[PDB]
Symmetry: C3
Subunit: 121 residues, 3 copies
């Protein structure tokens, strides 16, 4: 029996399968990406986040295009393979609150905080 | 005939119906909420609003999740109970302009204002 | 044969067809507008863009209403005349990456740049 000392690495090395994972980003996880990040991007953001928010502009701008690309994806998605998440159950009504819950604690607070700065800054 | 001096308060008091309104927020108005606020949030904003916009970051970030929760709501909504607003009539084409109208006066202005600050700041 | 010295201008002048193009903005291109701009708005932005991003607030706020107007348009669009772009082909999965591609170079960079400023600013 091949104790497999490292012969697999040679075969896999010549297969450069790693490349498959690189393309998978936009050629598969392209959807899960926008989500997976929001997780990794939050871990650090929580630690500390106080930039000029400039990043948002770039997003806000390109985001305009997204509504034409992404929305053109969702709109067609339901018509395409339609495979929404399995979590679906708490009705569509709560779906909105489900998000407002996490931020409810944040917004209600930060919302009044920033709004207050409006008085002077 | 019971002149109802305050017996109703006792019955209603033991019913704590008020709680029903609290949950209704996310357990009913969860959708109308995102809208109702935009009204109350605008009344004050108009009075004065000049923060660091930091609030947006929190929104922009969580907003990424929304596209996964909300969009997963709308996409399924049309498939669920489908009950769009009754205002629907001015075609879907104008629907876009209908918004651009209110801001048309704002953007066309503020858009050139902020863009101008790009020259120096 | 009428060499047409300028008689057309007189006829067209009395037709004020120009007005038709003005209304077409929100009465036709209302959809293409949100896109056409993003092109003209980017040409200058590229040249230079470093405002307080305040513009976003106005957008972010009104954007809340859009999800009620625009989304109510797309949701109904698929049900209305359904006429998505012809570009549709690279599957809906890549549709997400298709955008992440352009910004992939930007975000991956600016994302780490602004996040870094979090350390001090």
């Amino acid at each position: 029996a091949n104790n497999t000392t490292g012969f697999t690495r040679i075969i896999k090395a010549a297969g450069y399968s790693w490349k498959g994972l690189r393309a998978a980003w936009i050629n598969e996880a392209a959807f899960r990406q926008e989500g997976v990040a929001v997780l990794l991007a939050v871990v650090i953001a929580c630690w500390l986040d106080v930039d000029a928010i400039t990043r948002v502009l770039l997003i806000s701008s390109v985001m305009l295009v997204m509504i034409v690309e992404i929305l053109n994806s969702a709109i067609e998605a339901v018509v395409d393979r339609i495979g929404s998440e399995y979590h679906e159950l708490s009705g569509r009504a709560k779906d909105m609150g489900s998000a407002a819950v996490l931020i409810a604690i944040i917004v209600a607070v930060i919302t009044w905080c920033i709004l207050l700065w409006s008085h002077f800054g």
